[PDB]
Amino acid sequence: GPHMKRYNVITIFPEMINEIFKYGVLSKGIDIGLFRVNPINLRDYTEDKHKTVDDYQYGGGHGLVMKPEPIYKAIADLKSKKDTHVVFLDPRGEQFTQKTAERLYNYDDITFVCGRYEGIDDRVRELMADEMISIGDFVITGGELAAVTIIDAVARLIPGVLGDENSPNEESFTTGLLEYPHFTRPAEFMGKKVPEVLISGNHEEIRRWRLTESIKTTLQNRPDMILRKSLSREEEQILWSLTRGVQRKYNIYVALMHYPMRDKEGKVVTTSITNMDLHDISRSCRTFGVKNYFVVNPMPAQREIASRVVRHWIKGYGATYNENRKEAFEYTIITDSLASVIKSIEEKESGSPIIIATTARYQQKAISIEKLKEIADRPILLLFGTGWGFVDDILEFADYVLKPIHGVGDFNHLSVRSAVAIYLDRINRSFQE
Amino acid sequence: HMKRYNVITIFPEMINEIFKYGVLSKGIDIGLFRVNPINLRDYTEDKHKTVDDYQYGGGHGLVMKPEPIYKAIADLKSKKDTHVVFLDPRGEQFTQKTAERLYNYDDITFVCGRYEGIDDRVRELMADEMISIGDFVITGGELAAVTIIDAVARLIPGVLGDENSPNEESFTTGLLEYPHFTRPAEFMGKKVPEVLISGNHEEIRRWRLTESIKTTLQNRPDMILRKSLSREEEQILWSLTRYNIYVALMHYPMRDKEGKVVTTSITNMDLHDISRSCRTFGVKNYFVVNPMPAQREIASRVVRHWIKYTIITDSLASVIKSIEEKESGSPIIIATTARYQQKAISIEKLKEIADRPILLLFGTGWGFVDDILEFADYVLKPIHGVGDFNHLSVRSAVAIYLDRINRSFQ
Numbered sequence: 001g002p003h004m005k006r007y008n009v010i011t012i013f014p015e016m017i018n019e020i021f022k023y024g025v026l027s028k029g030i031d032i033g034l035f036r037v038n039p040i041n042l043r044d045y046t047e048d049k050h051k052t053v054d055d056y057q058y059g060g061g062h063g064l065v066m067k068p069e070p071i072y073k074a075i076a077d078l079k080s081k082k083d084t085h086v087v088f089l090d091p092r093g094e095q096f097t098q099k100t101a102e103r104l105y106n107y108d109d110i111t112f113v114c115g116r117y118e119g120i121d122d123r124v125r126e127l128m129a130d131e132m133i134s135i136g137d138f139v140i141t142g143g144e145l146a147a148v149t150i151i152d153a154v155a156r157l158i159p160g161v162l163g164d165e166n167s168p169n170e171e172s173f174t175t176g177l178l179e180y181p182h183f184t185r186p187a188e189f190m191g192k193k194v195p196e197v198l199i200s201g202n203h204e205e206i207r208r209w210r211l212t213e214s215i216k217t218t219l220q221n222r223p224d225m226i227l228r229k230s231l232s233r234e235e236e237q238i239l240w241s242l243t244r245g246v247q248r249k250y251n252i253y254v255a256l257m258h259y260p261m262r263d264k265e266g267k268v269v270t271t272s273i274t275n276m277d278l279h280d281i282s283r284s285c286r287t288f289g290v291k292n293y294f295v296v297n298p299m300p301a302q303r304e305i306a307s308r309v310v311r312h313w314i315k316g317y318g319a320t321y322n323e324n325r326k327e328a329f330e331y332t333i334i335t336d337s338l339a340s341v342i343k344s345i346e347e348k349e350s351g352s353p354i355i356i357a358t359t360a361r362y363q364q365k366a367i368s369i370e371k372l373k374e375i376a377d378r379p380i381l382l383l384f385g386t387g388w389g390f391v392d393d394i395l396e397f398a399d400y401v402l403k404p405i406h407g408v409g410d411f412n413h414l415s416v417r418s419a420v421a422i423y424l425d426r427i428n429r430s431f432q433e
Numbered sequence: 434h435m436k437r438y439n440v441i442t443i444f445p446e447m448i449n450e451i452f453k454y455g456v457l458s459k460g461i462d463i464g465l466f467r468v469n470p471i472n473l474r475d476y477t478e479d480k481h482k483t484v485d486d487y488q489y490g491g492g493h494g495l496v497m498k499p500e501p502i503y504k505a506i507a508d509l510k511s512k513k514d515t516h517v518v519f520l521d522p523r524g525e526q527f528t529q530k531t532a533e534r535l536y537n538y539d540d541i542t543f544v545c546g547r548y549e550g551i552d553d554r555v556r557e558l559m560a561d562e563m564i565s566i567g568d569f570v571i572t573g574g575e576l577a578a579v580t581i582i583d584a585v586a587r588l589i590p591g592v593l594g595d596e597n598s599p600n601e602e603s604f605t606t607g608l609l610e611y612p613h614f615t616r617p618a619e620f621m622g623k624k625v626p627e628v629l630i631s632g633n634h635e636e637i638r639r640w641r642l643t644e645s646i647k648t649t650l651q652n653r654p655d656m657i658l659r660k661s662l663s664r665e666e667e668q669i670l671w672s673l674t675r676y677n678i679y680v681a682l683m684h685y686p687m688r689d690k691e692g693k694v695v696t697t698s699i700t701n702m703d704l705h706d707i708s709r710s711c712r713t714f715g716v717k718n719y720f721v722v723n724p725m726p727a728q729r730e731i732a733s734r735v736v737r738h739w740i741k742y743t744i745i746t747d748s749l750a751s752v753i754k755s756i757e758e759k760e761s762g763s764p765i766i767i768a769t770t771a772r773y774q775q776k777a778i779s780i781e782k783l784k785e786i787a788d789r790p791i792l793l794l795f796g797t798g799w800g801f802v803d804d805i806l807e808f809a810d811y812v813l814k815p816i817h818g819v820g821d822f823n824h825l826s827v828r829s830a831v832a833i834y835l836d837r838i839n840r841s842f843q
């Protein structure tokens with residue numbers, strides 16, 4: 001809103017707060033009137049010779065807890081002068097992050113309540129707190145350092161508090177990423193040279209180098225942040241180049257077969273390749289780290305059609321038209337037979353896959369996906385069918401058959417594309433667990 | 434052996450002033466530990482005591498120079514073994530586990546940056562590790578250093594007394610702590626829990642453990658999942674923790690590749706494929722939502738032809754009124770997207786808050802514009818697999834989320 005930002009800090013150590021804000025860029029912001037820090041001496045709101053703000057807690061022992069009355073009066077006094085937003089600093093509160101700093105920025109007046117000893121009588125917290133905030137997943141002796149750290153993080157977002165020396169718009173966490181490294185003179189320090197692109201490169205080379213190192217530092221140190229970052233197309237392509245070739249504990253392959261399938265009467269048939277099975281299943285397989293998606297069809301003309309599609313997205317204009325479809329088709333292989341799939345996997349893994357077929361129908365001795373990680377020290381090949389599904393010969397050749405996907409009731413006639421997506425999600429969630 | 438914490442900073446007196454207050458200052462006075470601020474400007478050559486300079490690669494951002502920090506750390510190491518921590522957002526997120534690990538050192542040196550940060554060559558040459566105080570940015574490392582020192586020094590035996598014991602605390606236990614109260618017994622009509630006034634020790638212990646588990650479950654459920662619970666703790670949790678679905682496929686307002694708002698055309702297979710997934714998983718109705726009359730006519734012709742439950746309609750508002758008529762109550766509106774949104778929720782969180790019919794919204798094109806995501810009551814966490822690629826078709830996302838919802842009730 002329209003008022004200068006003001007941060008009131010209720011504390012038994014008000015001069016600790018004053019002293020902290022004499023230093024650094026924030027003290028300059030205070031000096032020229034961009035915000036204000038207002039320490040409130042909690043002992044002022046007492047009426048005994050000891051200026052008592054704490055007492056022995058209920059429940060036994062001699063642990064000390066801050067009393068409700070002084071804190072209540074201190075907050076009531078502020079509210080009597082101005083509207084304020086009341087934050088109790090407490091390990092039980094929201095873990096403070098950059099998103100918290102950006103949210104708290106919108107208030108014009110915030111009051112931070114600092115406890116000491118065991119904590120604060122929870123009645124005045126329930127009565128007066130607008131929220132609780134924790135500075136982190138650890139414990140400190142008092143809220144004072146939590147308060148000034150939050151004030152620092154919030155006040156440095158006030159326009160004009162910072163300037164050229166360090167901008168708040170491109171920074172770790174603010175961007176959803178960890179920042180790239182920084183360097184200054186000299187060009188070489190104890191044999192360690194500043195990256196040459198930063199010395200003699202053009203603007204675009206520098207930007208690309210910085211973006212790459214940021215994504216790399218984030219992937220390596222805080223992969224959890226990658227999952228929460230909405231990556232641009234450029235950032236995604238950098239990420240893929242960094243994860244390419246990383247081996248996981250599990251090597252899963254998917255094959256979509258078109259022979260031998262059943263017709264409506266159970267006779268053996270060869271099916272045509274459905275264009276969307278190429279698109280949809282290649283993207284599911286890539287999402288779940290499948291090592292290769294095999295498209296198996298014994299008819300030369302079907303393979304030629306499918307290979308042309310893949311080439312359009314890998315080497316033709318599709319590669320520019322939709323980069324993530326290219327990325328997914330990079331792992332798709334058009335081939336003629338299950339024997340070819342097995343020999344290809346044997347070449348890639350130096351071991352024969354365990355072959356697992358799929359069906360909507362009941363099969364004796366069918367397994368659940370939990371069995372898969374039991375045996376995932378070897379390559380796993382999941383077989384999916386087309387038409388009316390696999391003939392019985394394939395279900396018997398396979399090493400295992402997965403239990404069918406069911407929901408509620410009898411109807412479970414999913415597209416093969418939906419069945420692939422479900423089984424891969426189940427496998428991924430099982431292995432994480 | 435007394436613990437020593439050296440802080441390399443351009444503001445040495447800030448460090449000295451901070452440690453005059455509170456229980457930590459008494460611990461310093463009797464020799465339980467010691468904080469030694471190091472003036473980084475003492476390790477400069479010029480008249481201006483220069484510790485920073487403009488960075489390579491453009492602009493006017495200031496970066497801490499490598500040489501002063503190098504000389505400051507080398508000077509310390511020439512006199513005693515020390516463990517060197519660079520304070521940096523890119524480091525290990527500081528937690529109670531971190532504090533307990535750092536406690537084992539007898540001498541730690543904290544390096545505080547200012548402005549854009551520290552020349553990374555001296556970090557590579559001299560850091561033993563990097564530590565971040567949290568997932569946020571502050572103007573300098575000084576407050577991060579003193580906050581870490583506070584957290585570590587208070588685990589030194591004798592620093593704390595009976596005022597507050599460090600053995601049973603939030604995070605140290607893997608849980609959040611129970612509430613605390615002191616005199617008076619009643620404050621503005623609020624009575625202290627009577628068990629704490631007139632209960633026996635076992636009753637007080639049970640109440641505290643239950644409120645702690647209750648608080649942890651409600652505020653930090655992630656902490657519950659990480660904790661190896663006692664048999665008693667797991668029984669308490671159990672006692673604390675002891676649905677019609679609709680699906681709409683929307684074609685406005687969606688992003689195109691450039692992020693502009695568009696209406697998409699119907700994709701024929703979205704009609705058959707998503708129908709079969711909804712029918713498999715007991716969805717009450719599948720709504721196909723498109724504001725263009727010609728697209729609605731196409732969808733109706735595809736459905737009549739495809740067969741030789743699914744409702745073609747014009748707007749989200751029409752879907753909502755339709756469900757309100759069927760269920761005699763408004764649904765909770767849940768949007769889906771591959772992009773993580775703040776406060777997005779899991780399928781497991783959805784099951785716990787679903788006391789009304791649920792409408793799941795699925796997009797087309799390049800997905801929902803942000804305005805839809807903000808209007809929805811909740812947005813689901815994105816589907817992820819290996820974590821570097823999650824561009825699924827809408828048909829596959831429907832299948833996955835419905836299977837997850839089905840399995841959460843099994």
Ligand SMILES: C[S@@+](CC[C@H](N)C(=O)[O-])C[C@H]1O[C@@H](n2cnc3c(N)ncnc32)[C@H](O)[C@@H]1O
Pocket residue numbers: 089090091092113114115116117118119120133134135136137138139140141142143144146597601602603604609610
């Ligand atoms: C030793 S703490 C008491 C913590 C409490 N016994 C617990 O375990 O949850 C004393 C005061 O320091 C502050 N404090 C300690 N850790 C904090 C954190 N992580 N976030 C915010 N404030 C904290 C609080 O204001 C608290 O009242």
Ligand SMILES: C[S@@+](CC[C@H](N)C(=O)[O-])C[C@H]1O[C@@H](n2cnc3c(N)ncnc32)[C@H](O)[C@@H]1O
Pocket residue numbers: 358359360361383384385386387388389390403404405406412413414415416417419
């Ligand atoms: C259109 S379905 C044919 C359904 C046939 N009744 C069958 O054997 O599953 C084509 C392929 O999708 C997969 N599929 C479809 N529904 C499935 C389900 N409910 N459980 C497991 N796989 C399924 C199977 O791979 C099947 O070969």
Ligand SMILES: C[S@@+](CC[C@H](N)C(=O)[O-])C[C@H]1O[C@@H](n2cnc3c(N)ncnc32)[C@H](O)[C@@H]1O
Pocket residue numbers: 166170171172178179520521522523544545546547548549550551564565566567568569570571572573574575577
């Ligand atoms: C404004 S920060 C520079 C941050 C850097 N530009 C970035 O975005 O990652 C200046 C100094 O404050 C300290 N600092 C800022 N945030 C920190 C954090 N989360 N953890 C530890 N130190 C931090 C660091 O010592 C840093 O060198």
Ligand SMILES: C[S@@+](CC[C@H](N)C(=O)[O-])C[C@H]1O[C@@H](n2cnc3c(N)ncnc32)[C@H](O)[C@@H]1O
Pocket residue numbers: 769770771772794795796797798799800801814815816817823824825826827828830
């Ligand atoms: C083809 S996607 C649109 C583009 C998509 N937002 C992307 O970046 O990949 C069509 C719809 O499928 C759903 N969807 C696709 N991938 C998803 C994912 N990974 N997580 C959640 N929903 C997803 C969303 O409802 C989305 O609106």
Ligand SMILES: [Cl-]
Pocket residue numbers: 012013014015016
């Ligand atoms: Cl004071």
Ligand SMILES: [Cl-]
Pocket residue numbers: 259260336337338339
């Ligand atoms: Cl074959």
Ligand SMILES: [Cl-]
Pocket residue numbers: 443444445446447
């Ligand atoms: Cl100073």
Ligand SMILES: [Cl-]
Pocket residue numbers: 778779780781814837
């Ligand atoms: Cl989920």
Ligand SMILES: [Mg+2]
Pocket residue numbers: 167170171172179549
């Ligand atoms: Mg920056």
Ligand SMILES: [Mg+2]
Pocket residue numbers: 118598601602603610
């Ligand atoms: Mg405690």
